[PDB]
Design a binder for this molecule. Sequence first.
Ligand SMILES: C=CC1=C(C)[C@@H](Cc2[nH]c(/C=C3N=C(/C=C4\NC(=O)[C@H](C)[C@H]4CC)C(C)=C\3CCC(=O)O)c(CCC(=O)O)c2C)NC1=O
Ligand SMILES: C=CC1=C(C)[C@@H](Cc2[nH]c(/C=C3N=C(/C=C4\NC(=O)[C@H](C)[C@H]4CC)C(C)=C\3CCC(=O)O)c(CCC(=O)O)c2C)NC1=O
Ligand SMILES: C=CC1=C(C)[C@@H](Cc2[nH]c(/C=C3N=C(/C=C4\NC(=O)[C@H](C)[C@H]4CC)C(C)=C\3CCC(=O)O)c(CCC(=O)O)c2C)NC1=O
Ligand SMILES: C=CC1=C(C)[C@@H](Cc2[nH]c(/C=C3N=C(/C=C4\NC(=O)[C@H](C)[C@H]4CC)C(C)=C\3CCC(=O)O)c(CCC(=O)O)c2C)NC1=O
Ligand SMILES: C=CC1=C(C)[C@@H](Cc2[nH]c(/C=C3N=C(/C=C4\NC(=O)[C@H](C)[C@H]4CC)C(C)=C\3CCC(=O)O)c(CCC(=O)O)c2C)NC1=O
Ligand SMILES: C=CC1=C(C)[C@@H](Cc2[nH]c(/C=C3N=C(/C=C4\NC(=O)[C@H](C)[C@H]4CC)C(C)=C\3CCC(=O)O)c(CCC(=O)O)c2C)NC1=O
Ligand SMILES: C=CC1=C(C)[C@@H](Cc2[nH]c(/C=C3N=C(/C=C4\NC(=O)[C@H](C)[C@H]4CC)C(C)=C\3CCC(=O)O)c(CCC(=O)O)c2C)NC1=O
Ligand SMILES: C=CC1=C(C)[C@@H](Cc2[nH]c(/C=C3N=C(/C=C4\NC(=O)[C@H](C)[C@H]4CC)C(C)=C\3CCC(=O)O)c(CCC(=O)O)c2C)NC1=O
Ligand SMILES: C=CC1=C(C)[C@@H](Cc2[nH]c(/C=C3N=C(/C=C4\NC(=O)[C@H](C)[C@H]4CC)C(C)=C\3CCC(=O)O)c(CCC(=O)O)c2C)NC1=O
Ligand SMILES: C=CC1=C(C)[C@@H](Cc2[nH]c(/C=C3N=C(/C=C4\NC(=O)[C@H](C)[C@H]4CC)C(C)=C\3CCC(=O)O)c(CCC(=O)O)c2C)NC1=O
Ligand SMILES: C=CC1=C(C)[C@@H](Cc2[nH]c(/C=C3N=C(/C=C4\NC(=O)[C@H](C)[C@H]4CC)C(C)=C\3CCC(=O)O)c(CCC(=O)O)c2C)NC1=O
Ligand SMILES: CCC1=C(C)[C@@H](CC2=N/C(=C\c3[nH]c(C[C@@H]4NC(=O)C(C)=C4CC)c(C)c3CCC(=O)O)C(CCC(=O)O)=C2C)NC1=O
Ligand SMILES: CCC1=C(C)[C@@H](CC2=N/C(=C\c3[nH]c(C[C@@H]4NC(=O)C(C)=C4CC)c(C)c3CCC(=O)O)C(CCC(=O)O)=C2C)NC1=O
Ligand SMILES: CCC1=C(C)[C@@H](CC2=N/C(=C\c3[nH]c(C[C@@H]4NC(=O)C(C)=C4CC)c(C)c3CCC(=O)O)C(CCC(=O)O)=C2C)NC1=O
Lengths: 331, 164, 164, 164, 177, 177, 177
Amino acid sequence: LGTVLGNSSLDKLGLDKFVDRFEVNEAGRPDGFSADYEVIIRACYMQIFANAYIMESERAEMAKAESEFRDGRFTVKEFCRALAKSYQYRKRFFDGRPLYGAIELCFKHILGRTPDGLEHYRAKSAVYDTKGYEAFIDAFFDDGEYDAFYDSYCVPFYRGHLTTSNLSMAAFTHMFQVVRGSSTSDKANPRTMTNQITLNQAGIQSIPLAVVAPGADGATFLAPDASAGSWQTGFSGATKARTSHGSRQEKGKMFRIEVANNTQYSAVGGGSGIKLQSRSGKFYKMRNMAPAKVSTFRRANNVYLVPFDELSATYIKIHKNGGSIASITPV
Amino acid sequence: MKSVITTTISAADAAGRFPSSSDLESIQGNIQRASARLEAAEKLSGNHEAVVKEAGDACFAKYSYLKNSGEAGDSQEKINKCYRDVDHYMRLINYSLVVGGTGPLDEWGIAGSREVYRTLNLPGSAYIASFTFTRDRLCVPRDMSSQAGVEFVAALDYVINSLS
Amino acid sequence: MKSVITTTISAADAAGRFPSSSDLESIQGNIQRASARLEAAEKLSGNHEAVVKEAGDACFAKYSYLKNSGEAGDSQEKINKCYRDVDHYMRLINYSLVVGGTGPLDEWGIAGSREVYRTLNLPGSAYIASFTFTRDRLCVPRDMSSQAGVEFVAALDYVINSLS
Amino acid sequence: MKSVITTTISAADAAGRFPSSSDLESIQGNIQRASARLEAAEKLSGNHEAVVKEAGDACFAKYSYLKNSGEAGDSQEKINKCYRDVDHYMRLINYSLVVGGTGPLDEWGIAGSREVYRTLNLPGSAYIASFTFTRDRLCVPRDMSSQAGVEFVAALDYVINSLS
Amino acid sequence: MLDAFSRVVVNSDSKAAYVGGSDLQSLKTFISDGNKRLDAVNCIVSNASCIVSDAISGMICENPGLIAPGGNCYTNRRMAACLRDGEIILRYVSYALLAGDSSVLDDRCLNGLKETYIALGVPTASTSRAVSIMKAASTAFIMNTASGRKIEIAAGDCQALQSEAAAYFDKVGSAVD
Amino acid sequence: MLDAFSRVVVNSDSKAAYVGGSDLQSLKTFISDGNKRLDAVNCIVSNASCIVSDAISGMICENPGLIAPGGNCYTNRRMAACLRDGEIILRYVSYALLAGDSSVLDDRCLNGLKETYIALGVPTASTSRAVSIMKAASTAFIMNTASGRKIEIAAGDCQALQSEAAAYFDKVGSAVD
Amino acid sequence: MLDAFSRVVVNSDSKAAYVGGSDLQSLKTFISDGNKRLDAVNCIVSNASCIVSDAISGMICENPGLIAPGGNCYTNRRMAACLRDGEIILRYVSYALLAGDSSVLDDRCLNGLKETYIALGVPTASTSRAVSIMKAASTAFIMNTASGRKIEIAAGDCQALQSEAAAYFDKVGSAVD
Ligand SMILES: C=CC1=C(C)[C@@H](Cc2[nH]c(/C=C3N=C(/C=C4\NC(=O)[C@H](C)[C@H]4CC)C(C)=C\3CCC(=O)O)c(CCC(=O)O)c2C)NC1=O
Ligand SMILES: C=CC1=C(C)[C@@H](Cc2[nH]c(/C=C3N=C(/C=C4\NC(=O)[C@H](C)[C@H]4CC)C(C)=C\3CCC(=O)O)c(CCC(=O)O)c2C)NC1=O
Ligand SMILES: C=CC1=C(C)[C@@H](Cc2[nH]c(/C=C3N=C(/C=C4\NC(=O)[C@H](C)[C@H]4CC)C(C)=C\3CCC(=O)O)c(CCC(=O)O)c2C)NC1=O
Ligand SMILES: C=CC1=C(C)[C@@H](Cc2[nH]c(/C=C3N=C(/C=C4\NC(=O)[C@H](C)[C@H]4CC)C(C)=C\3CCC(=O)O)c(CCC(=O)O)c2C)NC1=O
Ligand SMILES: C=CC1=C(C)[C@@H](Cc2[nH]c(/C=C3N=C(/C=C4\NC(=O)[C@H](C)[C@H]4CC)C(C)=C\3CCC(=O)O)c(CCC(=O)O)c2C)NC1=O
Ligand SMILES: C=CC1=C(C)[C@@H](Cc2[nH]c(/C=C3N=C(/C=C4\NC(=O)[C@H](C)[C@H]4CC)C(C)=C\3CCC(=O)O)c(CCC(=O)O)c2C)NC1=O
Ligand SMILES: C=CC1=C(C)[C@@H](Cc2[nH]c(/C=C3N=C(/C=C4\NC(=O)[C@H](C)[C@H]4CC)C(C)=C\3CCC(=O)O)c(CCC(=O)O)c2C)NC1=O
Ligand SMILES: C=CC1=C(C)[C@@H](Cc2[nH]c(/C=C3N=C(/C=C4\NC(=O)[C@H](C)[C@H]4CC)C(C)=C\3CCC(=O)O)c(CCC(=O)O)c2C)NC1=O
Ligand SMILES: C=CC1=C(C)[C@@H](Cc2[nH]c(/C=C3N=C(/C=C4\NC(=O)[C@H](C)[C@H]4CC)C(C)=C\3CCC(=O)O)c(CCC(=O)O)c2C)NC1=O
Ligand SMILES: C=CC1=C(C)[C@@H](Cc2[nH]c(/C=C3N=C(/C=C4\NC(=O)[C@H](C)[C@H]4CC)C(C)=C\3CCC(=O)O)c(CCC(=O)O)c2C)NC1=O
Ligand SMILES: C=CC1=C(C)[C@@H](Cc2[nH]c(/C=C3N=C(/C=C4\NC(=O)[C@H](C)[C@H]4CC)C(C)=C\3CCC(=O)O)c(CCC(=O)O)c2C)NC1=O
Ligand SMILES: CCC1=C(C)[C@@H](CC2=N/C(=C\c3[nH]c(C[C@@H]4NC(=O)C(C)=C4CC)c(C)c3CCC(=O)O)C(CCC(=O)O)=C2C)NC1=O
Ligand SMILES: CCC1=C(C)[C@@H](CC2=N/C(=C\c3[nH]c(C[C@@H]4NC(=O)C(C)=C4CC)c(C)c3CCC(=O)O)C(CCC(=O)O)=C2C)NC1=O
Ligand SMILES: CCC1=C(C)[C@@H](CC2=N/C(=C\c3[nH]c(C[C@@H]4NC(=O)C(C)=C4CC)c(C)c3CCC(=O)O)C(CCC(=O)O)=C2C)NC1=O
């Protein structure tokens, strides 16, 4: 939505729902009522599985640990640990994922920030390789961080966007790549589904990522991958570069514009409805006045670096092709 | 136990701030709809027996197969378990009807109904037959009141949608 | 998907070790029980049609009330839904029977069965009637083998105990 | 302690499931490889003394610098520490050989060996010399059976690869 | 958490019968006294930080040892946590006035508190003194007899409810001692 | 967790001695009795929810005070947790039959359970009643003597194994009392 | 994760039929080739630290610029992570030999690895070199042709399985490049 209007810029970023907080305020064991606890329990699944879907069959898994939260056994710290050790949590996040996809998830589930630097990744991966999985999970829970922010009776929440756990501006932007507003769950969200590491290249090098709001304009945009030129030989046509050095910084500052849905059916050349190359049905663009069968835009989502005085023109042309603009950040 | 009072005290307590005028408006609404709800609770406390007798007799005016092989009809005792379970349901409809939220009915009856009904081979559909029978057998100005009947229907609907 | 291979590889993977000799003894047992399970898979792939026809015909040799009002008997279509559901079940008994763990049958069939069966008002007891019929209607040396018959019964038991 | 039994009980327990047919096949494999492993355990229990004596004597048939200045040769006592450590190792190869996973050998002997060996200046290479000596000095049809020999070699390989 | 409604329903539930007419009649008296309870809770919520101000300042000015060096009010941090604790006590008392039942306060505020102040070393007689000051100050605000603010209300008698609020404060003050 | 293998190794471990002859010979009897133990655990695993069903229904049908209003079975919720507890007891018993040793049961299910019940007020003799019914029920399934399901098995004698399973159930029943 | 059994089940599931006789015959050839696969996995798992040692020592000893100041093996920390990477590659390859299917490796180890090594500055051609050395060294251990360790195995032909393991290592080497 809109960053002004009602004053609450963050809510319209998609993070409006996640304000709700859940601290058990009742001392002593529950007997009978099981309302408040079933709410806190449900919030633990909403945090730890990040809105993943668990069924009656899947409620039989972790039924014991669930019956130990309700007793003077586990704080929610330790209950959250018990949900994090179990068969389910490993099926979803660990077994499908790479150690760094999995690391990044474990911070979204357990701490609710993203990893910022590579040092977090080195620490947790090394704990993993020394000892295995359960000490990996403990090493999230058994640190100063969780204890300080949550205090063992608070169900975990997203705090990576907040300024109070300091992080870095990279962890801010990365925060929004990891959470895309209330529907998107770890399995459901694009670029984080299953095995793919949600952000490797970005997460390792602390690359700030332009933030695209959920819904709004080009919500369905995933960045095109870049290689490294000569060294480790790689394709050099795929995306615009983040940097723009100069002698073209003339004509005003460079704007890195992301365009989000490019498609044959949508691409029209400014004039409504699909243009026909031949009299009878042939629709792809002619190469040398010979039929080609190659898509006019080849891979949805190309980027544009455009200097300021060429903005308006570029801004027109995208809308001529029916491409929709995700995010435009000055570079 | 989910009522207006427990909801607003619980929410404003979670917030941690004295109860503001908003919660005061909420309990204002509770004491507005109170007389209607208690009227329906009075009449349910009046004629609960015939309610449960027609509910069970209508439950076997439908599905007869229960008293066959046996699924559940192999004694007068198990059918007495039928009528006492409908006694418990109308007792919780009475309780929720007094409180004015589906809280007591949910925490006593509905929470964990499924494990029992799939485990001890109880078909829920016959419960549904009973409650839809009583829900069809109201009388608008003849029984209670516009407010009292609606209240009663709401509670009973919650039961069926918690079961089906 | 739970098999012997995926259990031990997943476990030793979660340790972070190379696969030691213990896992190798476990998959040694898998290649020991293999021929018996695959024999049962072969015979079920042999006569699956008559299996599902006798299963559904025995399901309506029991409860006839289904085809009445209607619960689910209101067409040849809904009874086609019946026989295709049992086709899926014997097809998953075949899949799990190949793999040799109740992995595929659980993740394809059993996971989230109960919300569908309570949501589409499907009584599970009739399924139970079908499967307990088939499970009663094996033959020790007449049908497959000592070990195969056992394997088949185990899979089918799992179905019933997942459902009742 | 990693064996087939404790792995599948621990895993099935982590699932929260009763133990399915997959675990049953795994323990079926355990009782298949059992006789070979126990054969090797019997013969190790037989001549363990001459095993440790040739292992240590071969450990100083290699590196003699140990008994010099001193690193670890400065008493009959420290060389007794040497041979008792090899006593412990063959005792754990015996234990793991019985259980049939490298569990006991890892949790008793291997886990945290490195900090002790770097802390007490004990070079691991000498252990490697001992075990590679014994591992070189078995006999294919002469001792146990093709299958037992293999099992023994496996366990002892684990020791060397856990130590280097 | 349990209001008046919940308590009638729970007592009738262990009694295992329908709610019935008699309990319902007493709860009808609750409903007809409804708006008096409402305006009462508005009186305690308004000017409540002023109650905590006066209460704790009275607790120090009665007992001057707290502010003496090495006392439990002696630190600026300690004074902060002192003020907050008085505020939270007052908060749950206000909730017990809305609910008409002390279940929120007994389950949530009263439980574990004696054991906590003891662990902290908080002097218990001083806390019961502060609870007493909040008691009488709060009843004087709830009865429109405050020396600073005598605000306009609809005319009536509310002695029942004053006895009720005094019962909540006496429950906390007996709970800490 | 410790199986039979681990128990032989732990006992022999204290004296720092090898497996030897006698212990391995008893464990050879374990391996030769292997398939009987396998099929036995298949008998207890199959129809196990039916065991929990019959057991708890028998516990209520013997002692009708549990379903009486104010009882520990009296609530739909309570009946759910009741059935689950029966299920978890049978679960770890099943693991104790696979392992051939009561380590998993003692370390994981048995510990803390008598005290958990005391706080709860769960009647302990009623739980030992339900454990006893799962014991007899489980031995009748394990001996192919179930009056409803008499399935085909390889013919043999397994009295040792019945005594074993009865030892585990008697361990749970003595553990709650 | 998916073994060869799971691949037959998934392919027959999208085919929507029973598994049938034909797929099962090829899987019978898998089971009869079972013990060769078992001893093969034992050959690659035994002396695997030595494989990683020889491989990375060969990678440095062929290309001396890695250990040169400014290289990616130049730091002691960097050499640690280098050795571990070789270890993990060989670990998941060993899993792919037990399962008989590359599901574990493709889903878990293979994915995003080119963009990770590129993202760190690791030279990819050098990694494919080290993967190739682990390939040939692993096939020479799996064929009992190791110049240092020629252990006893009963004699047969296993070329199928060597081609299989070569397929996994070529998958990794093509995956990093
Ligand atoms: C307008 C200003 C302006 C610059 C300053 C350069 C900066 C620059 N250098 C490279 C690219 C490069 N720059 C170098 C240079 C280096 N070789 C080394 O050994 C040293 C570390 C370093 C010289 C001191 C190399 C080697 C590449 C190619 C890198 C590769 O492909 O691996 C690229 C990517 C495009 C390309 O491959 O050319 C760019 C933008 N380009 C510009 O347009
Ligand atoms: C507080 C609320 C509350 C309820 C709603 C009931 C629900 C309930 N019913 C039963 C139990 C039962 N309920 C029925 C009832 C049925 N007979 C049939 O033919 C029909 C399908 C159905 C009536 C419509 C029967 C027959 C049993 C006994 C089942 C058996 O033992 O086989 C049980 C198990 C304990 C027992 O045996 O009594 C419970 C918890 N109990 C409660 O405490
Ligand atoms: C506490 C809750 C409560 C209920 C839900 C009712 C339910 C109920 N209604 C009737 C009984 C009845 N209910 C009605 C009502 C009417 N029938 C019509 O056709 C009209 C449409 C409708 C009025 C709008 C009638 C006419 C009877 C008597 C005959 C009959 O069964 O229809 C009976 C049998 C006893 C009697 O005759 O009074 C019962 C138990 N009673 C209660 O005490
Ligand atoms: C792959 C798994 C597999 C099964 C589980 C069976 C199941 C099965 N059995 C029969 C059919 C049959 N099954 C039996 C077996 C016997 N009936 C008795 O009364 C004896 C007690 C028992 C032998 C011990 C008999 C006699 C028939 C034919 C008649 C009948 O239906 O009973 C049929 C119908 C086709 C036919 O006539 O052969 C099927 C599908 N078939 C399979 O292919
Ligand atoms: C992969 C596994 C798999 C299954 C096991 C089935 C299970 C299943 N069955 C139905 C749906 C159905 N299943 C039945 C079957 C029944 N008819 C009766 O008389 C008996 C009680 C029962 C057969 C024994 C019927 C009748 C429906 C339709 C129900 C309705 O629309 O009222 C549906 C909802 C979608 C639909 O309408 O098809 C599903 C998911 N589907 C799957 O994808
Ligand atoms: C359960 C298994 C188990 C083992 C395997 C040993 C391993 C072990 N060895 C030592 C300790 C020792 N081990 C040796 C042995 C050596 N002397 C040498 O010349 C050789 C390099 C080497 C024999 C091959 C020596 C000399 C010490 C004493 C070292 C010292 O005090 O300097 C210690 C420290 C405690 C002690 O002083 O005894 C331990 C834990 N202990 C155990 O509990
Ligand atoms: C939900 C209900 C609820 C409460 C009732 C409070 C109770 C409470 N008070 C304190 C903590 C405290 N409470 C006081 C209060 C006192 N200062 C004095 O001079 C008097 C004796 C007394 C006020 C009458 C002080 C001073 C501390 C801090 C004590 C210290 O750190 O030394 C603490 C420890 C945590 C903290 O430091 O805040 C707790 C749990 N907290 C809650 O969550
Ligand atoms: C949403 C906010 C909100 C409030 C703040 C109250 C305000 C409120 N109070 C009363 C009404 C009243 N309020 C009081 C209160 C008292 N009279 C005394 O002399 C004492 C000083 C004091 C003790 C608390 C009395 C006595 C009445 C009239 C009696 C009654 O209505 O019960 C009424 C009835 C309508 C009217 O009088 O016009 C209302 C709406 N209700 C609300 O909905
Ligand atoms: C690992 C092993 C293990 C167990 C053995 C159980 C034991 C256990 N049961 C309960 C809890 C419970 N257990 C029962 C069971 C009973 N109902 C009755 O009528 C009978 C007396 C009895 C069945 C025979 C009930 C009713 C509760 C809930 C009690 C309550 O909330 O009032 C609790 C508290 C947590 C909860 O509410 O679930 C625990 C720890 N839990 C475990 O984790
Ligand atoms: C992987 C799964 C798996 C199983 C489920 C078992 C199944 C199994 N049981 C036996 C074999 C047997 N099973 C039993 C069992 C008993 N007989 C009785 O009369 C009692 C009712 C019951 C008590 C448990 C007996 C007595 C034998 C024969 C004796 C023996 O082999 O020790 C055999 C030997 C081979 C054969 O008989 O053809 C096998 C494979 N083994 C496995 O590998
Ligand atoms: C638990 C651990 C475990 C193992 C490590 C294996 C060990 C093993 N290998 C074979 C058996 C064999 N192993 C090999 C292997 C090969 N022969 C060659 O010449 C090649 C060098 C090599 C390629 C891998 C061959 C060819 C056979 C015999 C053929 C066969 O049985 O398929 C056998 C059959 C029985 C016997 O020979 O006595 C066993 C048990 N199985 C296990 O259960
Ligand atoms: C010299 C050290 C000292 C103090 C500090 C005060 C503190 C104090 N306030 C009281 C009680 C008290 N205090 C207030 C609150 C207060 N009054 C208002 O009108 C407004 C706006 C307030 C906040 C600014 C009220 C409303 C009362 C009730 C009495 C009254 O009607 O004023 C009482 C009586 C307690 C009781 O009844 O048991 C005391 C002791 N007294 C002292 O001796
Ligand atoms: C009237 C209130 C009442 C009950 C309810 C039952 C409950 C009950 N079942 C028993 C025991 C018991 N129960 C079963 C299970 C059961 N039988 C089967 O064949 C099948 C298919 C079953 C599940 C449907 C078995 C298998 C046994 C063992 C005895 C036997 O061989 O049948 C025992 C004996 C306990 C003991 O030995 O100490 C009792 C008390 N008894 C009662 O008095
Ligand atoms: C100077 C930098 C340098 C190295 C480091 C080596 C590394 C190396 N080892 C090889 C290959 C290789 N390596 C071993 C393993 C190794 N041999 C054994 O007998 C034992 C016990 C081993 C671990 C200690 C084997 C078994 C082979 C296969 C060749 C053979 O039969 O020895 C190959 C051949 C690769 C190929 O065939 O494509 C190379 C390049 N080479 C170098 O130039």
